Amino acid sequence: KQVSWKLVTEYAMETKCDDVLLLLGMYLEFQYSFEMCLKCIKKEQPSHYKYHEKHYANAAIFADSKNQKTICQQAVDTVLAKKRVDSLQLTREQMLTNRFNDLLDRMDIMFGSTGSADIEEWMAGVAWLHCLLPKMDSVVYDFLKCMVYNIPKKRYWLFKGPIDSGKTTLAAALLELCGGKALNVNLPLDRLNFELGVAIDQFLVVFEDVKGTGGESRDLPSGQGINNLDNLRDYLDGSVKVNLEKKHLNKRTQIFPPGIVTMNEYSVPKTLQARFVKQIDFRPKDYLKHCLERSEFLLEKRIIQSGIALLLMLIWYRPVAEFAQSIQSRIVEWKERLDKEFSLSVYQKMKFNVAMGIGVLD
Amino acid sequence: TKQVSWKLVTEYAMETKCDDVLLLLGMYLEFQYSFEMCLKCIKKEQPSHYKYHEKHYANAAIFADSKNQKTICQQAVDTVLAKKRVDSLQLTREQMLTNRFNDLLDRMDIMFGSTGSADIEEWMAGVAWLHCLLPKMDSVVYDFLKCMVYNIPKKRYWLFKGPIDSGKTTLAAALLELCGGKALNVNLPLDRLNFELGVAIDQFLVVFEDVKGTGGESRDLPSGQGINNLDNLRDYLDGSVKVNLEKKHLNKRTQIFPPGIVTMNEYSVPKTLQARFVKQIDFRPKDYLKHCLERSEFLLEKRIIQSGIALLLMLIWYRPVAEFAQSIQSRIVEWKERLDKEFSLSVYQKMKFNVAMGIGVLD
Amino acid sequence: KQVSWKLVTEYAMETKCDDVLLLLGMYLEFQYSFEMCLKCIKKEQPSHYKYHEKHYANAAIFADSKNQKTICQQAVDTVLAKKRVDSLQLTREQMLTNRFNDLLDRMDIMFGSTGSADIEEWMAGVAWLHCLLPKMDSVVYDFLKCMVYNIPKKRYWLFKGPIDSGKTTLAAALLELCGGKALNVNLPLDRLNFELGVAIDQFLVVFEDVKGTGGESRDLPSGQGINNLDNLRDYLDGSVKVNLEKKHLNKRTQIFPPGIVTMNEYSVPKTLQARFVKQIDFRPKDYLKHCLERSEFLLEKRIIQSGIALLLMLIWYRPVAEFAQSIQSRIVEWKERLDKEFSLSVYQKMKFNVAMGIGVLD
Amino acid sequence: KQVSWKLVTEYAMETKCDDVLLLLGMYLEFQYSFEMCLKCIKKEQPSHYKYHEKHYANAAIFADSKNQKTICQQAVDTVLAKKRVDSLQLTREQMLTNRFNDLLDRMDIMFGSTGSADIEEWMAGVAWLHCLLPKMDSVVYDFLKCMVYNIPKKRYWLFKGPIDSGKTTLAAALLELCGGKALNVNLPLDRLNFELGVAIDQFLVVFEDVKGTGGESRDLPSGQGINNLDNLRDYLDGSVKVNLEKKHLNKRTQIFPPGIVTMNEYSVPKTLQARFVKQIDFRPKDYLKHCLERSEFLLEKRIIQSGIALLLMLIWYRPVAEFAQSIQSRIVEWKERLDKEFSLSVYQKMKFNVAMGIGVLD
């Protein structure tokens, strides 16, 4: 007779949907018969086939409702409220553990019968990424600890090196593995605020491609990013809280999230250099390039820049004791799933091919 | 019974001082589920949750089906904001600070309780480190509090000065948490300062963080307008007459600027600005302080040395019960006794000794 | 079971509340039982104790309402509406008289059995202020008459003198005595017009610390204030209405308010100097300083900066016939209370201690 | 039982009230007993005493209404709608005739038993203004015709002369006699739009005190007004319609209203000079100044800058045949009222005193 707003809210929650139009579009697909639904039989989208049958009755009524968007907004607000709560109550590690569980759910599907991803091509991604930097898995592990501990004046890493050396690649994968936002600090000192406002409630922040002015005789463009960065000392330090706002849509005082800054070997003042407790230098590697040429899927399926590849790397290299206790049982299941499909020699072989500059799957 | 009680939601909001509509909505929705089979209540994770779930369960169940959830929460939050407005205008500075203290104490009863996740020993170690940061640290804090409460004209600002990494921000941040207030950056262009100053509206105290100035910049010290800007805010700092504070294209309020702190490196302070401070505290780097921390990482990892709770523990351990407000003097006795049952003067003195040696407080 | 919106509006009008959140927070206090109300019995706030009993019934219901904020907004709108009508229909003298009755109501409490003010400390304030300038009570009275008559070209007084000579102290007291706003015109000629918008519907305005140029030699910061004032002739003179804009919207076309300009001794053009009907020179006095050092309470309690100190001075010095007929009986009452508290000799002694720089109450 | 929104609308209309808070404030004064209403007996405000009795019943109910502001907004919109209609349907002369009738209503009261204005002091204003410019009444008459005809490229007059020569005075009086808005064109080329938007629906526009840059060695300040004016050629010409908007609150395409530009003898390019079909040069006159010194009421009561003084001047000098036929009967009544109180010699005497530099009423 009348639509259950609660049920729409429950769907948005289980789906973690915070987009009102997307929620509206998805729920409306449930108004059709679940009996011969091709979308459900073909198991195309989990966000659809796992919920159609259950929501069919409510959706049928929803389809006739005259307050559809209003119902969806309240659902989306409930999702936003839960993020609000988590942001204020969960420890930093729990936030991370939650993200890991969300990625593993995504992994269960892509590497499952729902069919889509070839777990072999992803481990090849792990091999390639493990040749981009020395002791790459330790680098990731240490980065995660630095992000969780969130120590004043010891929360930012600097990714520095020539173009095409892997800075954006690794930073993008870390951003997806942890959650967070990329920010452009090169903007003028009169809009750099609406930008910093995106950090609100964010676990981490990446200051992508910060352009300087020192040594611009090396084909290096001109930007204010560096100066506009050496003036955000209180933001980077994370000692005192800062006031952040994104338009009238949201405002909040808090310690600015920790993160990374990436730049193409410019000139870094000591006043800004002091803000970074670690600087990783990336270097172009002939073999990494040649490998990719013969391992096109890595780029075509955008595997090396994905957070799932980094999580897979942690599952393979890191001891179970290093993960949060609550998620350990699950990490064990994947370590076994990975050991079930890849012999050490088989994975080592992939690393070999990468170093040799040939196809990872050769 | 078939309709949500807005008044009950307002009561929860009021009890937890919730002035965030999204936070209220999310908190209340967690009460919709049975209280008998609640993981959150059995684990005693959040007081704001487990102390209220059972009582609000029936109402939350109804709230869960309501189609006006946001509107209900908005009125509840507006009530909390209205109360804050009344209190800011009618409570005495001393009462504001006292209520502030009762709240910190509640958080302490939990974090150091059976359901707590904090280790009282590591926090007392923070008090030890902090008591080595400055001479007679507990008097510095005590005197600062009286200064902020009395808010006497011309006697409202303290200058925190010294080299980088000497403790200026660590102490100011802990004081900001102990009394409440906002941190401001006045190292901006004159035609943008107005909005930063608006951040001080209704604040108990304000900290002008890392103010920089043109001069003596030979010490690798950057140039900044911070000093000049402050030197032009006499009426704000003195607090004799009210000033117009703006925020959101409108002077949201004309008031006595709050009292506070100014943290600053080793720049040259003009005479007309130096006159604005009733006290200047000098901070100095100390080998044992750095080395001690390296062996007591928990102090920084858990943000203990910059916590208002470390300072409150310090006052409870060092100051006479009589120096606290009458209303709370009882809780202070409660904490002084539990502090003595868990820490003999022997263990504390060694902690201070280890810090002085740069060993690692706890060992 | 129905809330009376009218009763909430009546409460707002009686306490002249035009702050929606304050009104809401105050009315909500009335929902609790009053018989044993300690706020009421210890008479802590007149805004509370004079109304709780009377509004308790309506408030109990109000507490059950789902439109609390909306009820309060209509109430606040009525208060704003009355001010609008009054600004357009009251005579300037009636406006001042209303202001005086409000200060007196506040004085009845302060110096009453439940007040927290010590009338002796406030009278000591009148003594200190009467030594700040020659014929002080005449200065204040002539100023009030100037502000009330609001005659074109004869509406602005210039307060000029060194730093710390009492310019702001007196300007602040007069602002409180008559009501109005202080304005900063040292801003760029750009964002200057939004500043003038602050003067909308104000009884008077004070251009605080107007800076110029050239005086930098005698150690005086530079600013545009002087220059800007020189270009605001039509605003200052008050012969023609001017267009004022506040909140990004032309709120009103009116005769700019009359007022004061305080300055730290810069050079003033003959054209600007012509905008002032009177100039008062403030001068530092060591005994005024020494007195304060031994009469701390005058600053700690902010007495010398208060509009109340000035009203008390007018009560003590001015003949009854100089006040508006309607408040005269109320003025006569305060004169009697003052004569009761202080003999001419007791007051003369205060003025003697000030002149001697020793402590007004010695 | 329930409030009549229609009746509130009728009041706002008869009162020409387009201010919601003012409307709210005024209507709420009608909720009180009309029997012993002091405001009505004292005949203080026409907007009140002429309507209290009639609205008493509706206002009493209004006082209890829960939608007060909403009711007032609809009333104000009705007033705005009527202006909208008139603006689009009335001829230019009818617009003027309507304004004249509104001023005469104002005059009937001020010069009537409601008591307030001394018609003798106002005619003295007519005398003074008639000595400010040669053939002043013809100047006004010709200006009105130019504003009504509104001929392309022949719609703007230039008021030019030294400071204190009468430019703002006459322009202010003409602005009130016709209706219209004063605009500041000195603003930067990035806000000069929100300003021009105030002209929408306006009968006339005055570009008050336009500052140039030519000859700034004569103590003449610096401004962009002149250039920002020589770029509004299409606005001044009024040949093609222009797009005007005042924030999101209103927008409209139309021919920019005709008007006046006033400036203190700067340098006027021929590219801008061509826009003015007439330029009136104002000159300081010793006797005008001395007269005012001995005729303080003229300035104190702001009579010489009022549109009512100019209307009185037209009633005295202009033949009835020159006014719109519909208003002629009324102009005759005032010509007789004026001839009833002032002999030609009596008025001539006033003009004499002005020329002699003595009190107009001597």
Next chain:
Amino acid sequence: TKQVSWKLVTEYAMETKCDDVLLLLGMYLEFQYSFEMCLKCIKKEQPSHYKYHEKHYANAAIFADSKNQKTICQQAVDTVLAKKRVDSLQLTREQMLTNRFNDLLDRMDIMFGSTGSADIEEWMAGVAWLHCLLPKMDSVVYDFLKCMVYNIPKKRYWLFKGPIDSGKTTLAAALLELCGGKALNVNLPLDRLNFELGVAIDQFLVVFEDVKGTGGESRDLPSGQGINNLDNLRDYLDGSVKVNLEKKHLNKRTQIFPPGIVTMNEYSVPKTLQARFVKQIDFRPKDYLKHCLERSEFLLEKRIIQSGIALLLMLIWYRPVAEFAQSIQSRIVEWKERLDKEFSLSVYQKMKFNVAMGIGVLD
């Protein structure tokens, strides 16, 4: 019957093409009063009033007491705007122009009727003056209309060029009223042009008024970016591909830029811009035109020579009924007959003679 009919208000709005909510509200409120004792209806002042008062009286009386007046009018106006949107997308350019013409004709039936206040003789005098402004003026207008209607790529823009006061704006303004459209000023900074161009959205035609350019400025001709800006708008002027038009921080619509006119003084036109025009008409000052007007002030006072109605009268007097759209060819016959009954070829030729002599058209 006790409730307002929104549909009836929408119908009135639709009948009068009222897309202004305030204008609709005010117009409708005038119908609330009795139609039997209506001064406005008895004086036949406004067709939009007297043609509808009686019919809407009953509904307006109810509307007058409604508490949702603005909401009702808004839906009625939204309907008129929706119709305009449909027509802009589905009517042919020829139909748009025809509807435009029927509207001008209605205004003409009234202004020159018994209830009218206009004098047909003075307006015909305007046609006479205008026919002396340019050679074969009626063909210039006729050809321009076909060009605007066909809207053929590369053949959409006419250049109006000549000294100041030669008739460029007078003609363009009359053409703007005859076909509808907006006037634009492109003499702005490149970083502000985008918004001006947005004014052209949905317009039938556009006139780039008084475009100025750097060069030959010796002729006392100011410098301007108008020329350079146009020279950089090839794709807009050509009308082969759609362009993105922005208005209100969003490309409200991607469309073929409208065709139109460019008025311009005697500046130097680059080759790449000159190529953008299919026709250039030269305007020249004429003594008799100026002197004629001085003796026929009514032409300027009533704005007759710059009126679309003067041009419509010109087409009706000079062009063969066959050159008009079929749908209206009947009304054109209606006007050609009344024009011949009021004006013999003798009176008209003298008018043109007087203009040529600079006497004063009508005498």
